[PDB]
Amino acid sequence: YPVKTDLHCRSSPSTSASIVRTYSSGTEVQIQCQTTGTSVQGSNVWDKTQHGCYVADYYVKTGHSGIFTTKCGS
Ligand SMILES: [Zn+2]
């Protein structure tokens, strides 16, 4: 799925968590799992990517709003 903007990928699903890497707009990401975290533009859903860090799902163009795949473990 493409990211919708330049999008931070963080060590935890929080906008205060450390930035591991930043994807340039349109970069293809795969979703390992989904969880909840900071509310970003109305969505508290966060996606763990192929790199093991978390992005705000609002900015991942999947067509889905709610969690739709494997839930991340605690
Ligand atoms: Zn930023």
Author numbering: 1 to 74
Study authors write:
Muramidases are N-acetylmuramide glycanhydrolases which cleave the β-1,4-glycosidic bond between N-acetylmuramic acid (NAM) and N-acetylglucosamine (NAG) in the carbohydrate backbone of the bacterial cell-wall peptidoglycan. A ‘domain-walking’ approach, searching for other sequences with a domain of unknown function appended to the CWBD, was then used to identify a group of fungal muramidases that also contain homologous SH3-like cell-wall-binding modules, the catalytic domains of which define a new GH family. The properties of some representative members of this family are described as well as X-ray structures of the independent catalytic and SH3-like domains of the Kionochaeta sp., Thermothielavioides terrestris and Penicillium virgatum enzymes.
Further, a complex between a triglycine peptide and the CWBD from T. saccata is presented that shows a possible anchor point of the peptidoglycan on the CWBD. However, they are conserved in all examples that we have identified of this CWBD. Structure comparisons using GESAMT revealed a similarity to SH3 domains as mentioned in Section 1. A thermal shift assay using differential scanning by the fluorimetry (nanoDSF) method was used to confirm that the interaction with triglycine is genuine rather than mediated by zinc ions.
